[PDB]
Each structure stands twice: as structure tokens, then as C-alpha cells.
Design a protein around this nucleic acid. Structure first.
Lengths: 100, 105, 80, 110, 152, 204, 99, 125
RNA sequence: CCAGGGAACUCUAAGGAUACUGCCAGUGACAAACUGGAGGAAGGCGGGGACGACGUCAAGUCAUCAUGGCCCUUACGACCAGGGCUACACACGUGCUACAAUGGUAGGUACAGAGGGCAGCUACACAGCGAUGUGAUGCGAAUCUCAAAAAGCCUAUCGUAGUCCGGAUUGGAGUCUGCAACUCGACUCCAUGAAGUAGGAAUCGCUAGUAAUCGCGGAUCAGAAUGCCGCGGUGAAU
RNA sequence: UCGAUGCAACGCGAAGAACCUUACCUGGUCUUGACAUAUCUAGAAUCCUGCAGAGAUGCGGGAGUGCCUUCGGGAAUUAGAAU
């Protein structure tokens, strides 16, 4: 993909990493049934006031090499295009052709 | 009998539609057993190493009862491609019609 | 729609704008791009300018509009 | 018999016949029949006038075609005169609940 | 298939009468692989005809109607000089039974009785005496086969 | 149209050039860092003649085995160039990884070195069929039971590209127990990219 | 009773590593109940091979995960003091429950 | 105590044979109680009744895997193997019906670009 | 796993055996080969898959990537909010669901394989008509779980009707995911109940565990499959 | 948004568009720039904040003074000065 899109994903994941723990504690606070109603509502308001890219839902994982937003595999971290080349070269351990 | 006129990588104009419909109805005048016609008008290359001469394409896939005949024509100009495609399609219609008529005797 | 336990979703900036407009009862439109915000009973009567993607369309919040999102009264596609 | 101003069939079972009232489906028919005393397997013809009146009073708690048709029409009219997106789809006779308006919108277009 | 005579599969006799003919009819009636279902319709129809006619051997009765149903002469589409005249030939014994069974099933499929078991029972009863759409179709085949009777 | 000769033989008569195990979460990180290592080191060791590299790793450290035909230039004087790359390899990789250099006894039997030599000559403007024939001759005399080299592109600078191949010997591609080395590199010429594929067949 | 579980992607490397682990205990005066092969995890991938189109043009890959596991009957000291020196990594993961 | 293993499609029946009355125990329950399909009921008794000895052996059958007719076929194959284990001269008569040959037929795998093992997507002409 | 703690059996997963026209009878140029038979689990390519020659179509891909040339550099580069890719007189191509009685519904009662689970699956209990919610447990898994397989079998009912078929559309009330469900989510409940009664010319797939039918998984994925890739159940006709 | 266009395009790229993805549009913004090397001016980076805004961003206040070599200072780092 474009260098702009690769860097935009990088900066989109930087905020997620920066606000990972605050979101965890805040989610526990809002989900606690022992917390006061106003307390959990205020915590929810703070969650909605957090920066937009902080949420891990705007993250779209892409190929490490090419930054391809489609054809991604979680196990390998590569798109289909580069995954096929690496597998056929043999650089991916354990992976081989399938026939049954 | 159906007539579809699609255009790949080109904007088919009213003039192109007329220039295909008039010849289609001319072939359908002598052959009345045509099921469908699909004409694709394309611009398949930019002529980057030959200067056009095959830059526009006109292809016709026609389906008759029990057979399907396809013809195509490459040309620099789309109207000339259309006319050459139409002539090939007419010749193939005549060929099939005469074979079918001579199968009875 | 939305879980009732989570309450209504009002955008923070539009909430501040309408709260500071309710103390004046001013009639000039509140121009906002947030069309996902819940229409609350507090904001009945005054007028917003909801972005439709291209321009802003005025929406005078009547009584029978709470229960609706802001973008419902701002059509996005224009088909004749 | 005759419930809610309509003459429901009397040759079938009560739980099936009660669905002929606009506003009563099958779960509502089961609830109505369990409300008073009536087994769903009994035909309307065998139902006695005492339990006819019982069922007729039971149906009154459910918004049926008299009130229901008016309520549905009012609910649609509210959107139509509101001018919201759903109202616009209602006055233009197009799908409102986010369904294909490109190829498959026939139970709407005609 | 312009090749060898591929061997035919081995049918398994049905459990009740132990007859491969009834097993083949069960396969004919069966659709979507519901062999147990087809078994139950075939058994219901056979029991209905056995009770109605008071006959001890339903399998023998079924063999009788089947042999009464299957044709003897069919017509095929030959080709000589781009011409299509129908040639009457003699149906092969394996094809006779299959044609008869298919005609019985497709004739019982369009009866007015409630269940398919009742429809099949009625069709079997009619075919045992020489009536019904199965006999109608078989006689319409013989009509063509004898109204050609000139192309070998 | 043709399967990769090593990929279709990976489990029958061949072996992967990566021999680490990772949990499904760890597989992505290991493979990504492994690919990065391969790319960085292949760009760094361009001058030297390095063939297949086996980045196999235990827990913690790794043992990266690079096979080459220029051990002196790779290692450096008294291991002064192998360690300079060692520090960078650890700096970008995880726990300090030991890199060991193996020697290619017959550089004309390694499909990668032959392909890269052809590519270098093509980039230096050597006549394409001269290069093809030179490579085929050298490899077929160096004991190889078969060689096939294929050039694709604007050969010599022609506007219309073409594919020219040269075979000598067996190279039985459809046999799985063939021990067929394969390589596919590119020569960056002034008129584009030439694809240089080399198949070298050397037994069973 | 220490329990060693071996996991890998190669079905020969795992067998040879398990054989070595069995051999050290069986030759340092101890009894071992053999390496039972636990069910492999076979996971497959459908990578379509063209860069643009032809979804029917696929490459079917598979990555097997083989697992073996060995128990010793009695952990004599001379037998057990060898496992942490039997450094066999780089292809096989070894988990020692030591329970 | 002549034991045989039978297999079919996916089921694998282990059957134990003893000279007895004819009590068939299919996975802890009687044959007719376990098999609700009469087609699958015949198949179990087919080898026993083929050589005219239905009520001559007590059978301890344990099926596992497979459907309801695959299990019947597996039980038949296992009974066949146990019967030939009991007597070798049973095999000449019990082979002509094909009861000892394992049925290697299996679900053909779904192939790529296909709807099923053989079914192909349609295309109108 | 369970025949009698057992080391039998099933199973799991590594290494091997077998199958070779090896043997018999024929036909065949004293041949290759073919036809049939025995034994065997398998017989002649046992079934299935991977493997795709020289070339063809200037076939597809400069938008995975790389790349010669051309072109833009306060812009054709870059950031953000909102909209849009989801529009609809319409046509075409792929499917799914039906038109019912070989069936719908309500009770019971069975029989699988394969795959996934910390970027999680959840035993169990309680609240709820339900989607789900709270508490809590076991499990990086042949341990715990997804998960109940569905078609099937027995009983009752419906009795040929646009219906106890069909489940589109629409009105109302909700649950989750997510900063956010209006454009434009998936599910749940109540209500409505549309066309559709087997489909013209024409046209397609399939030769055996196949077609047909029935369920169950996975990749992508916060949520979002009627698609795709798989798995087994029943199981033909020719 | 773009690509795929007879069989061999049309549940195809796309193994999954609410935002993001996104390439299109409207509006608001930046210009060595979101990203790499040449450079010299200060500083450990980094964390917590206030207001204004739809946000991109703009204007301001506190805590911390790295590490190896040590008075040339260096792997990283924030705001440009220009080719």
C-alpha cells in the first residue's frame, strides 16, 4: 500500500498502545455493578471523550511487507501474495502444500 | 431475441448504440431463429508499441438454438471495428442458416 | 439500536453547544457535523444545521423528534 | 363464531382460528387460550358461549384490528409528515430497513 | 460411454419381503436419499392393496402387476441421411423393468389421494387389472411402435 | 503455470530454510522478523556470493547459517566483518543470534549463484545468449546432470519482450525425487528488468 | 514423576527428539512409559495464487503441529539430572511439567 | 470369545462372538432397540443368517463413529471377521456374498472451485 | 480404550508389509497386450488429490510487489470531519428460501466427522418468552469447552386449503459489538403476512459413497455469510 | 473509487465498506512534508494538563535531566534552516 497508509496505520496503532491500559481500567469501571450510576456514566463519558484512534476497532491489520489490507492471515502476519512466495521458497517453517 | 450492448473501458454513446442496433436488426431480418446477442465494445490497449491499429475491439457473442457463435474485430477506430464485427457475424449467420437448411435434403 | 443500559449517545461537542444554547434560548442554528448524536428532550425547540455530507441542512427540533438520531432529518443521497 | 368483529373459522382448532384476527398471531392465541381455560386443540364450534364471552373479553387486552390498524397507520403517518428518512421511504414506496433498492425490492415496487 | 460395459451395482433386497424387485422400486420412489421414507410409502401402499384385495403374497401380486405393465416394443430415433424416422425395436429385459417402475411411480405421483401411499396403492390396483396412467402410457408407447411397424 | 520446484519438493526430498517452532501468537512475530532478517542480510551481502540461508532458531538465541562461496569477504580479516554484521543482526533480531558461514564447494552447482552471475553480466551489458551459453557450459561441466536457464524480458533492449531458454541434460521437473535446485533472480538493465531463472538437476 | 511434552512441525525431528529424551532415562537406569503420539493439529490455508483474479486458482497449504509426551516411572537423581543438559531446541519445544 | 473388528464409512464395530442363545447386545442395548431402521436391522443379522445359524451365538457389539447404516455395515463386517476367526471353512461361503471385503468407499473430499466433490457451479448459455 | 487396575480391543501417530498381470485358463505375430478365474482388504491406473510439456490468446495483473519511460511537486503529494462505495423506471450472471402431505407443527428418543478456543471457549446457578445479563468454574487443551448434530425413529394433529404451506415487507419493543448501528449491523420478541400452487423459448451439473438431501466447522473478522474453503450423515437412477 | 468483460469477467481482486479499511465526494487544513539519508542549533525520550475547534490542529503551564565515554562527545529523540 501507499507509504502514507502504512504510516497512518503506525500512528493509529501508537495511540492504541498508549491508551491500552486506561481503556482496560475504564471498561472495568463502567462494567462494575458495584460502582455508582453517576460514576459509571461519567467513566463512559470519559471513554467517549477519549481520542478517536485510541480504539482498537479503527485498526486494520495489513501485510508486514506490502501493507496489503486484504488477504491477511493472522498466523503468518503476511498477505496472501507474499505468503505464497515465502511458502514456495520454503522460508515459512512447517508450511507445505496440502493434498488429502 | 435479446440484444445487450455493453462497453468495457469505453463510454458507449447513442451513436454506437444505433450503429450496433441497425446491423443487428439487419442480420435478424434474414435469420429469425436468433435467441440472444451480446455485443461488448472495448478499448483493450493503448497501442503503446504499435500505434493503435488494434486499439478498439468489438465482439459479438450470439446464441442460437443449439449453438453459440462468437466473433470479434480489432481496429484503430471503434466504428470500423463495429462494421467488421457485424460483417463477420452476418457471414456466420448465413453459414449456419445454410447448413441447417441443407441438412433437410 | 442501542442497549438501554448504556443510555443515549450524545456527542460531547454538540452536547456542550446545545447546553450553552439552552441557557440563552437563542434561535441561530447550531451548525454541527455530528449526525449520529441522540436527540434529547432538552434540545426540543431550537435549530441545528446537520451536515448532510455536502452542505448543512437546518433541522428545527420539534416535539416528535426525540427518539431519533440527528442524521435521520438530513438526507444524504439526492435522487430526483 | 365471531370475535372482535370478524367471523373466524369454526371448523378448525381454536388456537389456529384465533390467528384470523388482525393483531393475534399464534403465540398470542396460545396466551389467550391459556389465560382462561381453553385447550388449544378444541374447535371453535364446540366452544360454549360462556367461554366465547371469556375469550372475547380476553382479546380486548390486545390491540386488535380496530385499534391496531389505526395505530399502525398513525405510526407511519407520523414519519411521513415528519419528513425523516424512513418517512421519505414510506411516501416513495421504497425499502426502509436497509434492504437492496438495486435489484431485489419487488415486495415494495410491485 | 464409447467404452467397456461398466458393471452394474449390486442392489440390496428390502427387509420385509426380501425381494430385489421391491428394493428397486423403493429406490425409484426414494428422493433426496430418504430410503427409510420410501420404504414406508412402498410398504404402506403394498399393505393397503394386500388388505383391500385380501391377497397373502404382496410380492407375488406386485410381480404380477409389474410384468403386466412392462412393455415389449419401444421406438427409437434412428438416423439415415439426415432423416429422423422412428424405428421400433425390442426393449432389453433390464430396461423393461426400469421403464415399468418409473411409469408406475410417475403415474402414482399425480393421483388425487391424500398420501403417496394411498396414491401408489390405487395405481397398483389399477395396473393389476390394466387401467391407470401407467397402462395408458404403455399403450401409447405400443401405439407408436405398431403405427410405425415399417422401419425394421 | 509451473509450481515452484523447491516448494513442491519441500517435504519429499528437501528441507525448509527455517527450523523454529512458535505458538500461533508467536508465529507472526517470528516469521515477520525472520523475513526482515533475510531481506536486510541479502541487501547487505549483495557483493558476496551467498546462496540459500537457513535461519533456524532455538528458544532465545538463533543460529543463522549462511552458505556462500566468498567466505573470506563474508567473514573479514580475523572475523572483523562477520562480527560487525553480528551486532546489527542482534540489534534488529531478538536474543543474540550466532551466525555461522558454510562453504559451497561447487559454486556452479548452486542455482542462485549462477542466476546472480548471469544477472550481473546482463546488468553490465553482456550479450544475453553469450551469458546463457556460458552458464550452461560451466554448470554442465561442473558435474551437474542437467541445467536449464531462462531469460525473460527486453533482451538486448528490444521493444517487444521475449523469453529465451537453454537446456542441457535432464532437469526432470515433474519428478519429485529429482534434487532440482532452482533460483529466479532479476537483472536490472537500462531497458527494464530481465527475469533469470535457473534449474540445476543433480541426481536423486 | 516429570512429564515431558514435545511439540514441533516436523514428524521426524519430533520422533528423534522424543527418542533421545527416552534414551537418556532408559540408559541412566530408569523406566519410561513410551512416547504416546497425541493428536496432531492440522491447519490449512487457501491462498489464491493469482495477484488479481481467478478465485478458483488456489494453493492449499497446511502446517501440521505434532505432539508427543513421555512420562518416567520413577525419577532417580542420576536420571533426572540429565534433562536440563539435554539441550535439544531449535525445531522442537519441550515442556517439563515436573509434577 | 472370537472377536472381530469391522469398519464402514466412519464407524468401527468391535464384536465378540460366543456360542450361545442369540442375545445380540449392540453397544449395551438390544439390536432392535438400538437400530430404529429396519434396513440397518437386516444387515447385522445378514452374515449369521446367511449360513443358517441366527440363534446360535451371543454377540457383544460395540460400535463407535459413523451414522446408522454405516454402523450396521461395520457390525456386519466385524461379525464376518469374528465368524471366519471361529471357522476358516466359513470364509468360502461367507465370501461369495461380499461380507468380508471391507468397503473402502468414503466421502469424497470437497474440491476447490466446486460446490461438492463433483458438483460444478452452473453457467447459462 | 475397558475384554478380563488391565496393556487385550478401539483409537491416536511414526516406521513398515501388501499389489507385482505374481499364479491359472484362454485369445494374440511363438509378442506387446487383452478376456475371464483363484487367493487376498484391495486386481490390473484400487478411490481421491498435488504435480499443468513446447506454445496460444500483444489473455489478466504497473491497484500486492518490483520495474523502463511519461507525467504532478503550496500538488495528481499529506492530515482530518461528514458523506459515498449500500442509490434505482431497468436488464443480466451467480446463489439461497419456497410453492408443501415423501410435508408443517408439538412432545419424546437416537447415530457423526472435521475444526476452533487468552485477539478466547465457557461447566454450573440465577434473572429473562428470547437474543442475552450477573456471579462463578475448567481449559492453551485426546484433560475443560464450542456442542445440541440435523435429516432419522415413535405418537398426536393438520386433510389439500394460498392453508397449521410459504416467510418477503412493514409497525412496535429490545440484546450485543463498537467512540459511534440515521444514512448503513447482526440477532430476539410481539404484530402484519407479499409474491409464490412447480415455472416459455432456451439452458446447466452429475457415472458411485457420485448426484440429491441433511446438518456441523473454519479463514477473513470488534460486530457483520445465503459467498468461499472444509467435514461427516442418509444415499440413488442410468 | 478502481480493476476483472466469450468460453477462460459478472458470491471475480474483496478471506468479510457504520468510522477505519478508502483509493471517490464536500468542507477544513500542511508544504523537505506522515516516511529515508546529508546538516547545525537546545533538550533524555517520556508522562500529566488547560482552553478553542467537527477534528486535523493553534495558543499556553508543571514533573523528569538519560546511558557509555567524560569535557570532541555517540546508537534514539522532539520543534526548523535550506538545498
Amino acid at each position: 500500500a501507499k507509504k502514507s497508509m502504512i504510516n497512518r496505520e503506525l500512528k493509529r496503532e501508537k495511540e492504541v498502545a498508549k491508551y491500552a491500559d486506561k481503556r482496560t481500567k475504564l471498561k472495568e469501571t463502567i462494567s462494575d455493578m458495584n460502582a455508582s450510576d453517576e460514576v459509571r456514566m461519567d467513566a463512559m463519558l470519559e471513554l467517549q471523550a477519549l481520542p478517536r484512534n485510541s480504539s482498537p476497532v479503527r485498526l486494520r491489520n495489513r501485510c508486514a511487507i506490502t501493507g496489503r489490507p486484504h488477504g491477511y492471515f493472522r498466523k503468518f502476519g503476511l498477505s496472501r501474495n507474499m505468503l505464497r512466495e515465502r511458502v514456495m521458497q520454503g522460508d515459512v517453517p512447517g508450511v507445505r502444500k496440502a493434498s488429502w | 431475441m435479446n440484444v445487450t450492448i455493453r462497453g468495457h473501458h469505453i463510454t458507449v454513446t447513442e451513436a454506437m448504440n444505433n450503429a450496433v442496433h441497425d446491423k443487428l436488426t439487419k442480420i435478424a431480418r434474414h435469420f429469425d431463429q436468433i435467441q440472444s446477442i451480446q455485443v461488448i465494445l472495448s478499448l483493450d490497449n493503448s497501442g503503446a508499441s504499435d500505434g493503435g491499429q488494434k486499439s478498439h475491439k468489438a465482439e459479438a457473442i450470439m446464441r442460437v438454438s443449439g449453438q453459440e457463435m462468437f466473433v470479434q474485430a480489432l481496429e484503430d477506430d471503434m466504428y470500423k471495428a463495429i462494421n467488421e464485427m457485424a460483417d463477420k457475424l452476418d457471414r456466420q449467420v448465413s453459414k449456419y442458416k445454410t447448413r441447417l437448411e441443407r441438412n433437410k435434403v | 439500536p442501542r442497549s438501554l443500559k448504556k443510555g443515549p449517545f450524545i456527542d460531547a461537542h454538540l452536547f456542550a453547544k446545545v447546553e450553552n444554547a439552552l441557557e440563552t434560548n437563542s434561535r441561530k442554528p447550531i451548525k454541527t457535523w455530528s449526525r449520529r448524536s441522540m436527540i434529547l428532550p432538552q434540545m426540543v425547540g431550537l435549530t441545528l444545521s446537520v451536515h448532510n455530507g455536502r452542505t448543512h441542512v437546518p433541522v428545527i427540533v420539534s416535539e416528535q423528534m426525540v427518539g431519533h438520531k440527528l442524521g435521520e432529518f438530513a438526507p444524504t443521497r439526492t435522487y430526483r | 363464531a365471531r370475535i372482535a368483529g370478524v367471523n373466524i373459522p369454526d371448523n378448525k382448532h381454536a388456537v389456529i382460528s384465533l390467528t384470523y384476527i388482525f393483531g393475534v398471531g399464534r403465540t398470542t392465541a396460545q396466551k389467550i387460550l391459556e389465560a382462561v381455560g381453553i385447550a388449544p386443540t378444541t374447535k371453535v364450534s364446540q366452544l360454549d358461549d360462556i367461554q366465547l364471552d371469556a375469550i372475547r373479553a380476553q382479546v380486548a387486552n390486545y390491540m386488535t384490528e380496530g385499534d391496531l390498524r389505526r395505530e399502525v397507520s398513525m405510526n407511519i403517518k407520523r414519519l411521513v409528515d415528519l419528513g425523516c428518512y424512513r418517512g421519505i421511504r414510506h411516501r416513495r414506496n421504497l425499502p426502509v430497513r436497509g434492504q437492496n433498492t438495486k435489484n431485489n425490492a419487488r415486495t415494495r415496487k410491485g | 460411454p464409447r467404452r467397456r460395459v461398466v458393471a452394474t451395482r449390486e442392489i440390496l433386497p428390502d427387509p420385509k419381503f426380501g425381494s430385489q424387485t421391491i428394493a428397486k422400486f423403493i429406490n425409484h420412489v426414494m428422493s433426496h436419499g430418504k430410503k427409510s421414507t420410501a420404504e414406508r410409502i412402498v410398504y404402506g401402499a403394498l399393505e393397503t392393496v394386500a388388505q383391500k384385495r385380501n391377497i397373502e403374497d404382496p410380492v407375488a401380486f406386485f410381480e404380477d402387476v409389474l410384468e403386466n405393465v412392462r412393455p415389449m416394443v419401444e421406438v427409437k430415433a434412428r438416423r439415415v441421411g439426415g432423416a429422423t424416422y422412428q424405428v421400433p425395436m425390442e426393449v432389453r429385459p433390464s430396461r423393461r423393468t426400469a421403464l415399468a417402475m418409473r411409469w408406475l411411480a410417475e403415474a402414482a405421483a399425480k393421483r388425487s389421494e391424500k398420501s403417496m401411499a394411498l396414491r401408489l396403492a390405487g395405481e397398483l390396483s389399477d395396473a393389476s387389472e390394466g387401467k391407470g396412467n401407467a397402462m395408458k402410457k404403455r399403450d401409447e408407447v405400443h401405439r407408436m411402435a405398431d403405427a410405425n411397424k415399417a422401419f425394421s | 503455470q509451473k509450481v515452484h520446484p523447491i516448494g513442491i519438493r519441500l517435504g519429499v526430498v528437501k528441507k525448509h530454510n527455517a527450523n523454529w517452532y512458535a505458538s500461533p501468537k508467536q508465529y507472526s512475530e517470528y516469521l515477520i522478523n525472520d523475513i526482515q532478517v533475510r531481506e536486510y542480510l541479502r541487501k547487505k551481502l549483495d557483493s558476496a556470493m551467498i546462496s540459500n540461508i537457513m535461519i533456524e532458531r532455538p528458544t532465545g538465541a538463533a543460529k543463522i547459517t549462511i552458505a556462500t562461496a566468498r567466505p573470506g569477504i563474508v567473514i573479514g580479516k580475523k572475523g572483523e566483518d562477520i562480527e560487525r554484521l553480528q551486532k546489527e543482526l542482534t540489534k534488529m533480531m531478538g536474543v543474540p543470534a550466532q551466525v555461522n558461514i558454510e562453504e559451497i564447494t561447487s559454486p556452479d552447482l548452486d542455482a542462485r549463484l549462477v542466476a546472480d552471475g548471469i544477472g550481473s553480466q546482463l546488468e553490465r551489458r553482456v550479450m544475453f545468449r553469450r551469458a546463457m551459453k556460458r552458464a550452461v557450459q560451466n554448470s554442465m561441466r561442473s558435474g551437474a546432470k542437467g541445467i536449464k536457464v531462462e531469460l525473460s524480458g527486453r533482451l538486448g533492449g528490444a521493444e517487444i519482450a521475449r523469453t529465451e531458454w537453454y537446456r542441457e541434460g535432464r532437469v526432470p521437473l515433474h519428478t519429485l525425487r529429482a534434487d532440482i535446485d532452482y533460483a529466479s533472480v532479476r537483472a536490472e538493465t537500462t531497458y527494464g528488468t530481465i527475469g533469470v531463472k535457473v534449474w540445476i538437476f543433480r541426481g536423486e | 514423576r516429570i512429564r515431558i511434552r514435545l511439540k514441533s512441525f516436523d514428524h521426524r525431528l519430533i520422533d528423534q527428539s522424543a527418542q533421545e529424551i527416552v534414551d537418556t532415562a532408559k540408559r541412566t537406569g530408569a523406566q519410561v512409559c513410551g512416547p504416546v503420539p497425541l493428536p496432531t493439529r492440522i491447519e490449512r490455508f487457501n491462498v489464491l495464487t493469482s495477484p488479481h483474479v481467478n478465485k478458483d486458482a488456489r494453493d492449499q497449504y497446511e502446517i501440521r503441529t505434532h505432539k508427543r509426551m513421555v512420562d518416567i516411572v520413577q525419577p532417580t537423581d542420576k536420571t533426572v539430572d540429565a534433562l536440563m543438559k539435554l539441550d535439544l531446541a531449535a525445531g522442537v519445544d519441550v515442556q517439563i511439567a515436573l509434577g | 470369545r472370537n472377536y472381530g473388528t469391522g469398519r464402514r464409512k466412519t464407524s468401527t464395530a468391535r464384536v465378540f462372538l460366543a456360542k450361545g442363545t442369540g442375545s445380540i447386545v449392540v453397544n449395551g442395548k438390544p439390536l432392535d432397540e438400538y437400530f430404529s431402521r429396519e434396513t440397518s436391522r437386516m444387515v447385522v443379522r445378514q452374515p449369521l443368517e446367511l449360513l443358517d445359524s441366527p440363534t446360535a451365538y451371543d454377540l457383544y457389539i460395540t460400535v463407535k463413529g459413523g451414522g446408522i447404516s454405516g454402523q450396521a455395515g461395520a457390525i456386519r463386517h466385524g461379525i464376518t471377521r469374528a465368524l471366519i476367526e471361529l471357522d476358516d471353512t466359513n470364509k468360502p461361503a461367507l465370501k461369495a456374498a461380499g461380507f468380508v471385503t471391507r468397503d473402502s468407499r468414503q466421502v469424497e473430499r470437497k474440491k476447490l472451485g466446486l460446490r461438492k466433490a463433483r458438483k460444478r457451479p452452473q453457467f447459462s448459455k
